[PDB]
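Bench notes, afternoon.
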Amino acid sequence: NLSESLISDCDNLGNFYRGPIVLDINKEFTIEDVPGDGDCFFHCLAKQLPEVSVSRLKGIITSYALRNWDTLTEAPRFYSDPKDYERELNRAGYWGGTTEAEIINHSFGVPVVIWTTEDKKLTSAVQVWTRKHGNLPELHLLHTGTHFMCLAPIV
């Protein structure tokens, strides 16, 4: 259940893949609650990036958006320009999600896999950014209700 194994069951939607995939969360994954002031996205990914704190992650994302707006898709769809995005992203209560997942994928190069669940027991869908460069281990998340948890395939 790493990124490349999932995409044949997804649609290729350009900058990411997405597909309905229904897996038993308790049977297939380990999941972890991580606190946060927003929706837990940044703490979850800071945990999975061992040399990167929450504040450093936001700084990397901010810089990447300022310098790579022409090659991003999600942030430019929802924000007028990188300055507008920087102002919102850097509020303490900002809710992270797919917009930052793309920036993390492009900046660190790492695959990002976000599973969604509607009933908290089975997944309903997965969204996948495939590797862009480097050899960092994949970042996986579960999006449940209005928050994110860390996720890893059971070994």
